[PDB]
Design a protein around this ligand. Structure first.
Ligand SMILES: O=C(Nc1ccc2c(c1)CNC2)c1ccc2sncc2c1
Lengths: 156, 39
């Protein structure tokens, strides 16, 4: 069906009406999203079908039609934009400076913007418009707010 | 059955709404891909 590069909404008709479960990125004929959005299930794009190709529950990432294509990374210094696609609302760029998730296996960038869980899969961008990661996997802080990591896959 | 709908282009927007803080947090990632706070 629609294979054009860009940001897409991931929807379902299983619940009441049409519900937005997440968001994803189409790039180089590959659909990239977060694992918790689709659970590895097949996707529909008009009359066409997207079958999963690669996935990992720990990284919380999944690619459809081909291997993960997104290889840009946050430089640890400059501001980024969350191209947020919220349920029932238009795509919107939100500029912020990322924080840090300090882990036993290294540091990761983190965006502190509050959006519904259906916004999961929204791409985080660098100044050149390159996707440096996906929004939707993080932690809940002392004030109920969500702080997501900048989750990036590995390009082979 | 899940489906996809195009929502726009992937572009950087100059003069976008600039908001949000930059916190430094101690986290742990489990086998299920869930993050948790370490103190
Ligand atoms: O529940 C959420 N995320 C999630 C669910 C299940 C799993 C994982 C993450 C990773 N391991 C499995 C959540 C909560 C709040 C917000 S706000 N914007 C995105 C967002 C995602």
């Amino acid at each position: 069906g629609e294979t054009t590069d860009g940001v897409y909404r991931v929807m379902t008709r299983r619940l009441l009406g049409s519900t937005q479960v997440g968001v994803g990125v189409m790039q180089e004929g590959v659909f990239h999203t977060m694992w918790h959005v689709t659970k590895g299930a097949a996707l529909r794009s008009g009359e066409g079908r997207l079958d999963p190709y690669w996935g990992d529950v720990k990284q919380d990432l999944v690619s459809y039609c081909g291997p993960w294509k997104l290889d840009a990374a946050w430089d640890g210094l400059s501001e980024v934009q969350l191209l947020a696609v919220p349920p029932g609302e238009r795509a919107k760029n939100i500029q912020t400076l990322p924080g840090i998730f300090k882990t036993k296996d290294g540091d990761i960038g983190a965006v502190a913007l509050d959006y519904p869980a259906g916004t999961s899969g929204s791409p985080i961008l660098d100044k050149c418009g390159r996707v440096i990661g996906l929004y939707g996997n993080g932690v809940v802080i002392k004030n109920g707010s969500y702080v997501s990591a900048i989750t990036q896959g590995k390009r082979e | 059955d899940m489906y996809i709908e195009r929502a726009g282009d992937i572009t950087w927007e100059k003069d976008a709404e600039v908001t949000g803080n930059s916190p430094r947090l101690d986290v742990a990632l489990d086998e299920s891909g869930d993050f948790s706070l370490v103190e």
